[model samples]
Target: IVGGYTCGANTVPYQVSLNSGYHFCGGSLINSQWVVSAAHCYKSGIQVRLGEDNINVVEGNEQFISASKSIVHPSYNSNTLNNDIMLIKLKSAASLNSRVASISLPTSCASAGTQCLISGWGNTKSSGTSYPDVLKCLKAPILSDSSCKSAYPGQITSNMFCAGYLEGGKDSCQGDSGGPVVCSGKLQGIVSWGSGCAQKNKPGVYTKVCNYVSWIKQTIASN
Candidate 1:
């Protein structure tokens, strides 16, 4: 239900097909050989499908590529939704000419109130149809660190960011979790949660990618 919005424009994420079909959600092209996505996407799946336009479903003629390994963050926990991020190693690096290019991390952290975009295969209205070919983009303001802490949950919680329209009726739902939240042409955050999608007074939350900067660097270093 979310896409376009300057998100897929630069940070083109790919989803890991949970079944045998070729489909993908939000993913970040980290290195030439790897792309980063949410851990839940790998709750149990294989064969990542990338370089496609319509993210809702995989069409045959789309650019399909197999994965070499699916690596979700070690701390991933679907229960508390802990490490809800992962990395998919491509069978071969996506070259610049192949309509594939890695998205760079935020040049720096984002300031409060900056506008950002998020895309995914989530419900259009919290429990609706997945947006077909044309991805939808929503405008959300970055909540203050304190507001995020007091807004149902507290603390930075390591590697997470808070972004969503608190006005309700707009949010990240089911399949939308683990998608990329982009700002300033860089990967900044990921769809995490709020009390409920589209719930009044409950804003859509996200994992602040910068909070885990050190860990991400170390992990990427080892790779």
Candidate 2:
């Protein structure tokens, strides 16, 4: 995350790294067997790393598990980037503890101006490569739908929302897709897309998690 600081160990228990040999995206542990992420990050043979703070060293608390199956939102559009959510079923259930736990799904929508946190191990640089070894987090305010529309014109959809400063700086970048945007202690959004990392008038866009609550529950129940 650009302009963010390292998160303390176990500070983000629900955060997980979606890896394909290396961390490519971030996800939230919603349950022992399921993780919520962005559909754009989907690929075969994804490895989910839980209880991880640093990606480079042995954290001992970390658990590496393969994805058994994944279900991307049926309406997901690559062109428009709408409905960009996905759920990954773990090969085995994660053992919950202080260092590894599931986060609660949002029961209601977060309004504009709500302070939210975006966390990941994504690049800290907007113009260059600089992936962080430790988890990083940035606090941003949710922008009004109107304001978001003004920033991106017709690109902002109901399934998506924007959060960050208008001037630039703090924002989610490459490798942060599928990461959590927590509001009111609940999972509110998933890092989806943006014009560029921490660019002026271009806040980070995210998948609105509240709209998919029912879909998420039904998918897990039926599967």
Candidate 3:
């Protein structure tokens, strides 16, 4: 996360890293057995590690488990990057605690200009790769749909929204995909895509979590 600070240990307990040998993406635990992340992050043999603060060292509070099933949105369009959300069922349910727990889904959508918190271990630089060993966080406000569409003409969609400084210097970047964007203590967005790490007029785009609430609930209930 560019222009962010290291998170206090276990403060963001719902955060989890999606790994395939190394930390490739981030996700949020929504329940004991389910995780919500970006659809593009899905792959065979992905492991989910919960209660992680630093990716480089073991803190003994981690819970590593494999995916039992991954369900990407049926209408997900990879080319346009629309509906870029997915659900993962864990092979085993996580043991909830202070250091490891689930975050609540949003009861309502976050409005434009609402300040939100985004946390991850993504690249800390706008140019070049530099993944932080510890989880980093930044507070950014949500941008209006019209404003977002103007910034990325012909790219913004209803399922996506922007959040970050218009002047740049704070955003979720590479390796941060599928992470949580919490607003009012609820899961509001999922890190999805952007032009670069943190560029002017190109705020970080996220999967609007509110748009998928019903889908998430139904999917969890039936599956």
For each candidate, the alpha-carbon lDDT, in order, equals 0.62, 0.94, 0.93
Point to the candidate with the largest TM-score.
Answer: 2
lDDT of 3 by residue, 1-223 (tens): 9999988888999999998899999999999999999999989898999999888899889999999999999999999889999999999999999999999999899999999999999999998988788999999999998889999999988889999988988888988899999999999999999998888888999999999999999999999
Q: For candidate 1, give the lDDT of residue 58.
A: 52
Residue range 84-139, candidate 1, lDDT tens digits: 67776767775543445555676578888988777765566564465445345666
Sorted on lDDT, best first, the list reads: 2, 3, 1
Report lDDT (Cα) of residue 167, candidate 1.
60
Clashes of 2: 0
Clashing pairs in 1: 13-27, 15-24, 15-25, 39-84, 39-85, 160-207, 160-208, 161-207, 161-208
Clashes of 1: 9
The regions of model 3 sitting more than 4 angstroms off are: none
Residue by residue across 109-148, what tens digits does model 2's lDDT show? 9999999989999989988989888999999999999989
Task: Give me candidate 2's TM-score against the actual structure.
Answer: 0.99
